[PDB]
Structure formats: structure tokens, C-alpha cells
Design a protein around this ligand. Structure first.
Ligand SMILES: CC(C)[C@H](Nc1ncnc2c1CCN2)c1ccc2c(c1)[S@@](=O)CCO2
Length: 168
């Protein structure tokens, strides 16, 4: 459980690796994996589609049942559901989609959800098609999360850019 290996240490609680979060979850068996979710928990692509496919759609069926009873999440919010075969729990976190006009200041609320868990495997929030500047997302993570977070970024070019920028 929680056997993280091959990460670069950015701060005493923030680590980063060039890796697919699904492959890390299979290797590590973390207590918590974070999903880069949307408010209706529709796992149609990106991190969410990869995690759901690796559960053979069990995550989508569970998420639809959660939304039917509880309604959608808010941007900046989260919920804890099963991790299925990938982790004990999946923390579904909604970062702002600035390509759809959502407020970038909600990225701090999004990362604050990680503080409820002592250790997590997570993606870089609001990056990719959500449109936030990834260097800014990493700075928000480092300034907001106080628990131990292991970031898997599935792109070597982005990984090297983020490390270079943080070592300036
Ligand atoms: C930046 C990009 C490379 C990253 N993708 C991944 N990171 C880690 N493991 C992964 C991926 C894809 C498959 N497996 C990512 C980060 C947040 C993010 C997205 C995508 S999009 O899903 C939607 C909005 O949030």
C-alpha cells in the first residue's frame, strides 16, 4: 500500500513524476487516487476517462448512482467514492475549466480538498483541456496542499517544463 517510487521531490510534501496516473495506481495501490472530474461525474476523456476505463466502467456506474441521489458537485468541490481496483478510494475533484469561463481562483478550493487525506496520488488540476496555466496550477498545489501529494503528469515535455520552472 502507498509504495510510491521514481518521484522528484519538489517540497517536503509535494512530489512529481512523468507517468500515467492509471499505471501509477496499479503499481502503488494508493489509499486515495484523485480524479480530475467534472460536476456531473461524466468520465468521457482525459484523466477521468482513463481511470474509468481501467475500472471496466464500474466507476461510471457508481458515479451515475451518486449524482442521482446527491446532485452535481460544485466547481472547487469534491466527493469520495470507491477506488475500485485502482485504490481504496477515489477523490473526485472539480477544478475550474477556464476554457468555459470558470474562475481560476477556484483552483485553490479544488486543491484544498486534498488536505482531508494524509497521502494521495493525483493529477495536475485544471491542466489539459481545462485551460489553466500548468505552472500556475503547480504553484497553487505547493502553496495550498499540506498533506503528502504525489503528482503523476502524463507528458514528459510538461514534466520537464514544470520542474525547470520550479527550480528557477
Ligand atoms: C496535463 C495532462 C497531461 C494531464 N493528463 C494526464 N495526467 C496523468 N495521467 C493521465 C493523464 C491522461 C491519462 N492519464 C491532465 C491533467 C488534468 C486534466 C486533464 C489532463 S483532462 O482530463 C481534463 C482536465 O484535468
Amino acid at each position: 500500500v502507498n509504495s510510491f517510487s521514481g518521484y522528484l521531490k519538489l517540497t517536503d510534501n509535494v512530489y512529481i513524476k512523468n507517468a500515467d496516473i492509471v499505471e501509477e495506481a496499479k503499481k502503488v495501490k494508493p489509499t486515495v487516487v484523485v480524479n480530475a472530474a467534472n460536476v456531473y461525474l461524466k468520465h468521457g476523456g482525459g484523466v477521468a476517462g482513463a481511470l474509468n476505463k481501467a475500472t471496466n466502467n464500474a466507476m461510471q456506474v457508481e458515479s451515475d448512482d451518486y449524482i442521482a441521489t446527491n446532485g452535481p458537485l460544485k466547481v472547487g468541490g469534491s466527493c469520495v467514492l470507491s477506488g475500485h481496483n485502482l485504490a481504496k478510494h477515489c477523490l473526485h475533484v472539480v477544478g475550474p475549466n477556464v476554457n468555459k469561463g470558470e474562475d481560476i481562483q477556484l483552483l485553490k478550493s479544488a486543491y484544498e480538498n486534498f488536505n482531508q487525506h494524509e497521502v494521495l496520488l493525483a493529477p495536475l488540476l485544471s491542466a489539459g483541456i481545462f485551460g489553466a496555466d500548468p505552472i500556475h496550477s503547480l504553484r497553487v498545489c505547493v502553496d495550498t496542499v499540506r498533506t503528502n501529494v504525489y503528482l503523476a503528469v502524463f507528458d514528459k515535455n510538461l514534466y520537464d517544463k514544470l520542474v525547470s520552472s520550479f527550480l528557477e
